[PDB]
Design a protein around this ligand. Sequence first.
Ligand SMILES: CCCCCCO[C@@H]1O[C@H](CO)[C@H](O)[C@H](O)[C@H]1O[C@@H]1O[C@@H](C)[C@@H](O)[C@@H](O)[C@@H]1O
Ligand SMILES: O=c1ccn([C@@H]2O[C@H](COP(=O)(O)OP(=O)(O)O)[C@@H](O)[C@H]2O)c(=O)[nH]1
Ligand SMILES: [Hg+2]
Ligand SMILES: [Hg+2]
Ligand SMILES: [Hg+2]
Ligand SMILES: [Hg+2]
Ligand SMILES: [Hg+2]
Ligand SMILES: [Mn+2]
Length: 264
Amino acid sequence: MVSLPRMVYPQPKVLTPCRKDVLVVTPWLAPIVWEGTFNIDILNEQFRLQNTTIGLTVFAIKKYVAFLKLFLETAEKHFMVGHRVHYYVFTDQPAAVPRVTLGTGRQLSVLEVRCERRFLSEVDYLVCVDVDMEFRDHVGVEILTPLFGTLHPGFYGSSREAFTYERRPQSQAYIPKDEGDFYYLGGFFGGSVQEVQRLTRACHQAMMVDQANGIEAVWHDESHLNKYLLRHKPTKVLSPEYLWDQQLLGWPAVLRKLRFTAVP
Ligand SMILES: CCCCCCO[C@@H]1O[C@H](CO)[C@H](O)[C@H](O)[C@H]1O[C@@H]1O[C@@H](C)[C@@H](O)[C@@H](O)[C@@H]1O
Ligand SMILES: O=c1ccn([C@@H]2O[C@H](COP(=O)(O)OP(=O)(O)O)[C@@H](O)[C@H]2O)c(=O)[nH]1
Ligand SMILES: [Hg+2]
Ligand SMILES: [Hg+2]
Ligand SMILES: [Hg+2]
Ligand SMILES: [Hg+2]
Ligand SMILES: [Hg+2]
Ligand SMILES: [Mn+2]
């Protein structure tokens, strides 16, 4: 918006692809975020000049409160470092939330559960993730955009017919075998506050319609998220570097970094 300052960095090479092993842009021209595609210094400048605030939301119900300490401590080392961050922890056990030391410009709010406009006034972007995870490497502003989904680590190389989308036409989440771009994760999505609220509102309404008709999608919210992103294309797609399970899937050559991973 304001001009970027002078910066010294390698010149982009028009005749050299960033990657010869993976797709780095979708058919609707949204970038697919892989290591080796972005210069983080340029992106950090762009987002800091806008004084960007990122909200990170997690739910920790019942036994999942045990995952909060590692989740938050590692987020402090790797998530949006240098930028304003507001953590929102939705839990049924407020007194069980660990006291984690936060860097400057970062804050945490504990919301007890069994608001909407609140997010609009407190943050610019919302990132919604699973709590039984830990950050192991950089997760930064390269992911920010109006609406993003993340490629599920178990299906990124799969054909659409093999995707575990909801296949019963009676469900609002129904996707037939000849449709679908990717299989996105329910555990890592986000975007501007406005777009995230539109997505969550749509999934809530679709799930209510299914409940009324006596049907529950095969993968619950994730099935609905996939239907939403099929019909409302995300403006960025995150590669599986952003949500990986090393125990189950190892460390493939196509992954130069494992950024956020499942906890055993
Ligand atoms: C065909 C081989 C696929 C291996 C990954 C399966 O992951 C599960 O996928 C379903 C949809 O088919 C759901 O998304 C489910 O939540 C996934 O399991 C969870 O994520 C994986 C990566 C792993 O961490 C599991 O332990 C989780 O339960
Ligand atoms: O009793 C529960 C069950 C689920 N969750 C939340 O729901 C997310 C999805 O669940 P889970 O991690 O069990 O899903 P999986 O990745 O194994 O499909 C978790 O990350 C938690 O944030 C929770 O807080 N309490
Ligand atoms: Hg590149
Ligand atoms: Hg959220
Ligand atoms: Hg979430
Ligand atoms: Hg929902
Ligand atoms: Hg959703
Ligand atoms: Mn999980």
